[PDB]
Design a protein around this nucleic acid. Structure first.
Lengths: 609, 90, 114, 285, 17
DNA sequence: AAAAAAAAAAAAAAAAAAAAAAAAAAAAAAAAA
DNA sequence: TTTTTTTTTTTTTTTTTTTTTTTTTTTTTTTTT
């Protein structure tokens, strides 16, 4: 058959120059790869900086706890109440280790639950981690690493100067219970000899630590509880300050934004999974060609226009927002390639200014509706962002219900809310819009509209119809023009937003059973034959493949399956037929749909119900 | 053990039989579930209770004492309140 | 104060109803001592019965089952070597107050399905 | 996909079509290189055999790279073989330690020292018969997290993510691809994990005394429609077929060696129905 | 519709102005 | 629904395979002359 | 520069630990009444 279907081995090495940046140069020098690398590195550095600014307070508390233990038997321990998303947490501990290597306050060993199956392996991993941590800051065997060697090493090194011995346990729930209890007893027995600090990584609650630590074990424990900020709070902070930040030209659409937030809030609280899904979305957007490399600031996009080729204009011609720009004006647009080359920077500055005014109008309207009760549009910026990019926001009945509830209030609360909206929008314009390039025209366009709103507030505070005038003016100069949908968007807005959701939905969320169910119900969806078509999903025509017929034939039967009537009904549908049926029951057992029971002479049981 | 003829017990069975007494005692009104669970664990690690060798609050057990030892403990205990000393008789 | 995702909450109360509510009564309650054991097919059946949204059986749902096992909210009384083969048996290892808190923050009454 | 729970509670043109399918899947290969460059891993989950597709990806694209092809459907595969293979044949560092997670720690520490040295590994049937435990998936997910090591893998079983928790699924930074070919499972199902003529061919190689002994066993079994040891020993001793009892135990162990009679507790039951035994008894006359 | 036939019809009607 | 056989599975003992340690042997570096 | 001594690394051999086979006993399932 094949070279790799050997009956003896299972693994095959194709070493070509291995000893003790995957793509070529022709793809890297393309401008979309450089633009995607710059944008992804910017977004990843911003998310890392936000996570550092979130974690730094609890990091300082833990460092002060270790130092205050050093300035000082039971051992001092510190349960760190992290979230359920474990792969987000260990990097946090690494940051703590770096700070504990800054002040020379301790040296840190990390005990994973995979290394601590027994007490011997846990003690050996602990001593080896501490000794190699000292060796790496400034080799013993596996069976040589003992607590007596740790005591001798600590006497030889750090008795003359004290360094704490911080023991970090990142996955407290996944430990063997008896190994963890005996490790706490071992560490508490050596108090006074070796200064031990025990940092825990409890993910669920303090009830877990109180349950898995018995009476005699918790008699030697002086724990102090720390709290980390929650994963929905970190998600909302990342969404407020990065994904809605105006200084990135790459926008998401409403459906992809809702898809990624649904993946976070409904399935798994993993910030890293959100980051990798957003990275895949940014990669799938920018990997459409050099035409999508114009999605940056103004000067770099103008340069990329000046270096652009012919096929990039040919693929910005095909995008659906380009054609109503043509129909609204013709003989030079569609083929001549230079009329569009001189017409593009106006469209680029139009889309950039439209998205900047969209963010500012979104800030204004979320301050206006955010303190309102009953929240018909949502509380934060993100739900209003989805509802304002999805559809016509004024044609939606939720905005009319919002207007009915804003009319049901007094004049004092309305005046206070619109003054708060004016002050917040001016603060957002002076802080975050002002350093941004092509931001001067943004303020110079949106600010006289705000002067109109503020003068309407001035006439309603000087004198019920002026409240309605303020509401309709807020509608007319903020909600109508600067808060469009994605269908009422400007021309050629595809380069900047990303609406391709079915391909990303297939390639991020994995549905093996849907594809198996479709390929076993109608193979015509995959084979695309002119003969295997089915009107309904149970016709069972004769030109079907073999495994589809056997799956349909066992699907209608009961729990227990006989070989005889199933083989006879297969002969009724479709020698070598026995070899084909043996091949079919082997392939259908291989997928996990049925199972041949052990010494049930021919009867096989279906595991799917 | 005297009612069910040395059947194996549990934390929940003994906690129910104790909480029926603690509601009328006028001394043990304010004990939680976790304090009685820690008292059960202290009886377990002193081997006055031995496992049959499941969750910790549901693992089956055996009493490692005789009835005469508990009856002598009821006479030798210092400052035993009279509610417990009356509950021990019936 | 254990924060969970939405479908992890529903899988956790479905596992509580799978361990508590007397599997002979599953023929009546959904078709429209000690915690008893259950198989993951029964857990997914009760999950789709009580969710009433009929979400897709993707990889994230079974990953949520595995990471609720990993977080010691469920456990493995039997199996652990035939986890995909249908002979693995799980057990729920939480109480009634947490299930009532989950049902309150969702809005789904568990005492109707108890 | 929505499975209905009530069922649990109540309990030619094909070749050209497959050729067009395979050309469509061969179109995805520079996209797969662009995806593997950015840190993702490839997972295929179609219906048919994805062996030939991954082999053609290894031939047409990864022809000069360090590629460890692992057959997960191999029933005598172990993690010791894969880790010994990585530490010894690629990295030249001898046998991996017996702790496999320590071997993965060694592999991470050794691949940290050699950047721009990428190990690709192509695992046909990642849910294979010896990778369905949690430890092997933990080792494979720890290998997939390394920025030098890239992973392509196949998935065929229906219950595959039951052993991937969210930590393994964030280590396995998968890009899921629906590579549904319609090829049959010839190479995957051929191995070791998946008669009256045999009885006559075994009875051909018997001697005269063993023929008389099995004749006595089948004659008693068909007369009384298993048999005890004592009456069998008396029947062999009355016909001068045996010298002692231990020679009968040796001949019955020789019979159990060839799966002809079954011992039970000594009960001797022949595990074939009475009608074919009657035909075999009439065959010698 | 197809971009080819739409571009062709728009160019043909642009010659029909 | 219970009594009794029966095949499958678990416990335990015993032997082998593999890992680890310790000694022998060969190669290398540094002193003797 | 050549010879002899002592260090270092490799290879072989022995010991200890882990895994695997094999026998025994239990144990949950299946057939008969």
């Amino acid at each position: 058959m094949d070279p790799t279907i050997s009956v003896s081995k299972g693994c095959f090495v194709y070493k070509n120059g291995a000893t003790r940046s995957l793509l070529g140069k022709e793809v890297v020098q393309q401008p979309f790869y450089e633009e995607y690398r710059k944008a992804w590195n910017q977004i990843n550095d911003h998310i890392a900086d936000l996570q550092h600014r979130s974690y730094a307070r609890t990091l300082e508390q833990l460092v002060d706890f270790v130092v205050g233990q050093a300035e000082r038997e039971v051992l001092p321990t510190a349960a760190l109440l992290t979230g359920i998303n474990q792969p987000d947490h260990l990097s946090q501990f690494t940051a703590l280790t770096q700070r504990l290597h800054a002040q020379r306050a301790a040296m840190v060993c990390v005990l994973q639950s995979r290394d601590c199956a027994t007490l011997k392996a846990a003690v050996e991993t602990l001593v080896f981690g501490l000794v190699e941590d000292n060796a790496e800051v400034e080799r013993l065997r596996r069976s040589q690493c003992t607590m007596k060697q740790l005591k001798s090493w600590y006497t030889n090194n750090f008795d003359s100067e004290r360094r704490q011995l911080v023991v970090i346990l990142p996955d407290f729930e996944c430990f063997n219970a008896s190994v963890l209890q005996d490790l706490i007893l071992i560490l508490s027995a050596h108090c006074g000899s070796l200064p031990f600090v025990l940092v825990l990584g409890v993910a669920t609650a303090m009830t877990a630590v109180h349950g898995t630590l018995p009476y005699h074990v918790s008699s030697k424990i002086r724990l102090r509880v720390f709290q980390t900020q929650a994963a929905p709070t970190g998600l909302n902070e990342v969404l407020d300050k990065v994904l809605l930040s105006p200084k990135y030209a790459f926008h998401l659409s409403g459906k992809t934004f809702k898809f990624l937030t649904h993946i976070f809030l409904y399935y798994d609280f993993s910030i890293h999974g959100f980051i990798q899904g957003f990275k895949y979305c940014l990669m799938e957007h920018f990997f459409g060609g050099n035409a999508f490399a114009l999605c940056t600031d103004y000067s770099k996009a103008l340069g990329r226009i000046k270096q652009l080729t012919h096929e990039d204009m040919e693929t910005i011609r095909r995008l659906p927002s380009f054609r109503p720009y043509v129909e609204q004006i013709i003989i030079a647009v569609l083929t001549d390639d230079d009329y569009l080359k001189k017409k593009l920077p106006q469209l680029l500055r139009d889309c950039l200014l439209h998205f900047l005014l969209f963010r500012c109008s979104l800030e204004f309207l979320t301050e206006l509706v955010g303190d309102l009760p009953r929240c018909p549009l949502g509380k934060l910026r993100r739900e209003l962002y989805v509802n304002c990019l999805n559809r016509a926001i004024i044609s939606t009945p939720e905005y009319k219900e919002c207007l009915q509830m804003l009319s049901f209030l007094s004049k004092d609360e309305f005046v206070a809310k619109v003054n708060r909206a004016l002050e917040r929008t001016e603060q957002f314009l002076v802080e975050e819009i002002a350093p941004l390039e092509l931001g001067e025209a943004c303020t110079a366009v949106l600010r006289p509209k705000l002067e109109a709103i503020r003068l309407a507030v001035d006439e309603v505070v000087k004198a019920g119809r002026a409240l309605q005038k303020t509401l309709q003016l807020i509608e007319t100069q903020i909600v109508q023009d600067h808060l469009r949908a994605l269908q009422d968007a400007p021309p050629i807005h595809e380069l900047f937003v990303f609406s391709d959701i079915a391909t990303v939905r297939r390639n991020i969320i994995g549905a093996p059973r849907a594809a198996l169910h479709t390929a076993l119900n109608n193979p015509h969806f995959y084979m695309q034959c002119k003969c295997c078509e089915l009107q309904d999903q149970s016709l069972l025509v004769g030109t079907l493949p073999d495994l589809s017929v056997v799956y349909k034939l066992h699907l209608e039967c009961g729990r227990m399956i006989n070989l005889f009537d199933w083989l006879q009904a297969f002969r009724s549908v479709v020698p070598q037929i026995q070899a084909r049926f043996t091949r079919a029951v082997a392939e259908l057992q291989f997928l996990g749909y049925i199972k041949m029971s052990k010494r049930k002479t021919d009867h096989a049981t279906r595991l799917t119900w | 053990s005297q009612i069910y003829d040395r059947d194996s017990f549990n934390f929940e069975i003994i906690y129910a039989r104790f909480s029926k007494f603690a509601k009328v005692s006028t001394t043990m009104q304010a004990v939680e579930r976790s304090i009685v669970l820690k008292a059960f664990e202290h009886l377990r690690i002193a081997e006055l209770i031995m496992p049959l060798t499941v969750q910790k609050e549901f693992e089956m057990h055996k009493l490692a004492l005789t009835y005469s030892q508990i009856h002598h403990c009821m006479q030798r205990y210092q400052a035993l309140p009279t509610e417990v000393a009356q509950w021990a008789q019936s | 104060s254990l924060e969970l995702p939405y479908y992890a909450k529903f899988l956790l109360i479905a596992a509580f109803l799978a361990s508590h509510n007397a599997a002979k009564q599953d023929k009546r309650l959904f078709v429209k001592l000690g915690p008893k054991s259950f198989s993951i097919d029964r857990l997914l059946a009760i999950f789709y019965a009580i969710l009433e949204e009929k979400v897709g059986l993707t990889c994230n749902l079974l990953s949520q089952i595995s990471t609720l096992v990993h977080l010691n909210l469920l456990s493995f009384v039997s199996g652990e070597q035939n986890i995909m083969e249908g002979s693995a048996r799980l057990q729920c290892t939480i109480g009634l107050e947490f299930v009532l808190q989950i049902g309150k923050v969702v809005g789904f009454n568990v005492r109707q399905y108890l | 996909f929505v499975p209905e729970s009530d069922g649990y509670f109540h309990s030619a043109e094909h070749e050209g079509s497959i050729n067009a399918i395979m050309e469509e899947y061969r179109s995805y290969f520079p996209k797969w290189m662009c995806i593997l460059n950015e840190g993702f891993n490839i997972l295929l989950y179609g219906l048919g055999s994805k062996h030939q597709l991954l082999q053609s990806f290894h031939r047409e694209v990864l022809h000069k790279q360090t590629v460890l092809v692992v057959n997960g459907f191999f029933p005598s595969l172990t993690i010791k073989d894969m880790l010994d293979s990585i530490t010894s044949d690629i990295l030249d560092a001898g046998i991996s330690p017996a702790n496999p997670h320590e071997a993965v720690d060694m592999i991470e520490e050794e691949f940290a020292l050699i950047p721009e040295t990428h190990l690709f590994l192509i695992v046909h049937n990642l849910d294979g018969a010896m990778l369905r435990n949690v430890k092997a998936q933990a080792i494979l997910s720890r290998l997939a997290r390394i920025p030098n090591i890239h992973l392509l893998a196949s998935i065929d079983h229906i219950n595959t993510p039951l052993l991937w928790d969210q930590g393994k699924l964030c280590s396995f930074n998968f890009s899921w691809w629906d590579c549904t070919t319609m090829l049959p499972y010839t190479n995957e199902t051929a191995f070791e994990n998946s008669a009256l003529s045999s009885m006559r061919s075994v009875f051909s190689s018997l001697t005269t005394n063993s023929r008389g002994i099995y004749m006595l066993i089948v004659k008693y079994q068909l007369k009384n429609k298993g048999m005890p040891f004592r009456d069998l020993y008396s029947s062999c001793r009355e016909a001068f077929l045996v010298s002692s009892d231990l020679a009968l135990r040796a001949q019955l162990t020789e019979f159990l060696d060839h799966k002809l009679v079954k011992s039970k507790r000594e009960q001797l039951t022949i595990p074939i129905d009475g009608a074919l035994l009657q035909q075999f008894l009439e065959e010698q006359e | 519709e197809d971009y080819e036939i739409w571009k062709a019809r728009m160019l043909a009607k642009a010659q029909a102005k």
